[PDB]
Design a protein around this ligand. Structure first.
Ligand SMILES: Nc1ncnc2c1ncn2[C@@H]1O[C@H](CSCC[C@H](N)C(=O)O)[C@@H](O)[C@H]1O
Ligand SMILES: Nc1ncnc2c1ncn2[C@@H]1O[C@H](CSCC[C@H](N)C(=O)O)[C@@H](O)[C@H]1O
Lengths: 343, 345
């Protein structure tokens, strides 16, 4: 009945593009640097933006306006204009003391190559077996090996997410305690292993990745980088880490990965899986969005991939030869899961 | 700081693309066709989708559950699986008795050409005098519509649906069209606005004044004569003029030029009738603010000179263009009708 304000549903595409602009203009760091609970005018923010455009503050106010009404920024309207401060939702856009924030992930997820592929997600409903591989011509990981800007943006997105995930993991999960050697299958640029190793310096880390990812991985002490193809085989390992890998693949390919892991482990070895877990009852909450967001990104980037429930992860482990599963909830849907090879 | 769930801010880009998919798959009409409070499973929705893909329901569920978590649809988990129903926010996606919905507008504003230009709105901050669309595409938006027929059609249908929606609300409140005999719609789109007015007031003779490529796309409406031209060079002589969602496309200088040409085309006592959303002075998380901020951001990307305006700014434009009398008619949730009156003796 309210068609008039239903036209405002166009805000759903405006908001993420306004946010990307504000991130690229470094708005949130400028606000945070001004003081603990600073509220800055657009002109005060523009003072820290490298531009000599006199109309920059008027233009910036149009972007921050939308973010404030959307609760990404606080907006207080005063007589000379609006002033903007951080909110609980935008704190994560400011780097921590090690220089890590969600920004690399947010820029990747809204990058051109991803948003372009989003126009074809209805084809996964309409066309059996069709797959990015439409929109672009190869699979996402091959495309990354070919487009270095995408490789870098994705690798940095996953590295930032890795620091963020393991900072949460280490408050709850102590299973890395007794380990001596850990092979990270698809471990990205090695950030996960570096985080683990810095916490447990006795761990020998081996990062197992595609050549075009390894080529741009920095050298962390205690980490050796090995190139390979996890579908053909995984290096012999006392224990294996599998973080944000299984959710890239359908059941058949996930079982193949896990079976290769099983073959590389000795009796008693463990695969440590780190994923978000799809809740049984979905709703408007952090645990739901934390799984539904990567699930939709998978549908456009590697639709074989999908997020899974605890029951589905146990089913993958048992189908791959693992006898015992153990589930360790971390935070808001993030889980560590242990797949134990029998002793 | 909850960095972990802050990664979920990626949902902001997923949500409009999920909604666009659901629109293109006709999900909302399918649910409505089952009943007012119908709640359908993905398998039942897929039954009305032309596909032979046995995995369609599982795939559709991945899109729907995101819309349900974001309150665009209801998502209820039953023993057999999830079912989905319409909400107050998604009723506007179902066409009315005449086949009119917000869908044409929603498909245009998430169109590839619009979204691609969105990547350069930061350039309006950084560079004096820059073009998000004119940079992204090499010419201004209206010329680009002249060149790409699919964009011409998507935009014209978006504006046409928005016109019916807007005037359905206008006619509940505004009586100023009652005694008019002639109305020239400057930049009137494909003429839907005049058709809505004339059908409620059959004595009004309408003149739709538009660019050639818009006229070529327009149907024949009774009582509406189409005239091609360029409003910046001049406007046809008119007893009264309609200006709906035109001024917000242009900066103050060009808005004044349009209004001055309107003044020159009017006799004494003639009126410009302006229909726009009005930017409120104090903004918040509400319809009236989003109803202005949303087209404002679209204008920032499509023709950055364009901007949404306060009542004080509209009055200033009218006065700078030779209209000394202004009247403001709030319609609903920020939409206003405004009358700029040319003086009589
Ligand atoms: N066939 C293959 N063999 C080894 N790694 C592969 C692979 N196919 C894809 N990958 C890698 O799997 C990774 C999944 S993204 C996850 C990266 C990292 N584990 C993290 O949690 O941040 C990508 O880095 C990709 O390069
Ligand atoms: N120089 C010009 N002369 C005449 N019309 C123009 C113009 N430049 C842009 N326009 C038209 O102005 C319109 C603005 S969109 C608004 C259309 C219509 N009044 C409605 O409310 O739905 C477009 O249709 C565009 O074709």
């Amino acid at each position: 009945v309210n068609y008039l304000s239903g036209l405002g549903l166009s805000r759903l595409i405006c908001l993420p593009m306004a946010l990307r602009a504000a991130i690229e203009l470094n708005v949130f760091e400028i606000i945070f640097q001004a003081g603990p609970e600073a509220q800055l005018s657009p002109a005060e923010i523009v003072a820290k933006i490298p531009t000599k455009n006199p109309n920059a503050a008027i233009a910036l106010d149009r972007i921050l306006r939308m973010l404030g009404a959307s609760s990404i920024l606080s907006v207080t309207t005063m007589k000379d204009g609006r002033v903007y401060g951080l909110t609980e939702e935008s704190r994560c856009l400011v780097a921590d003391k090690n220089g890590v924030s969600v920004v690399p992930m947010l820029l990747f997820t809204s990058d051109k190559a991803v948003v372009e592929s989003f126009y074809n997600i209805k084809d996964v409903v309409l066309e059996e077996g069709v797959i990015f591989d439409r929109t672009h011509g190869m699979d996402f990981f091959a495309y990354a090996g070919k487009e270095q800007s995408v490789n870098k943006s994705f690798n940095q997105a996953m590295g930032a997410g890795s620091t963020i995930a393991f900072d949460e993991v280490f408050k709850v999960y102590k299973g890395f305690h007794d380990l001596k050697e850990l092979v990270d299958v698809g471990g990205g640029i090695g950030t996960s292993l570096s985080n683990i190793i810095s916490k447990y310096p006795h761990i020998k880390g081996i990062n197992f990745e595609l050549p075009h990812v390894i080529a741009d991985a920095p050298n962390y002490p205690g980490v050796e980088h090995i190139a390979g193809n996890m579908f053909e085989g995984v290096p012999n390992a006392q224990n294996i880490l599998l973080k944000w890998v299984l959710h890239d693949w359908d059941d058949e390919r996930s079982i193949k990965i896990l079976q290769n892991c099983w073959k590389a482990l000795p009796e008693g070895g463990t695969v440590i899986v780190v994923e978000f877990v799809l809740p049984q009852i979905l709703g408007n909450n952090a645990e739901s969005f934390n799984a539904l967001t990567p699930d939709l990104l998978m549908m456009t980037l590697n639709p074989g991939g999908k997020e899974r429930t605890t029951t589905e992860f146990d089913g993958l482990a048992k189908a791959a030869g693992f006898a015992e599963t153990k589930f360790f909830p971390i935070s808001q849907g993030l889980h560590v899961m242990e797949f134990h090879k029998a002793t």
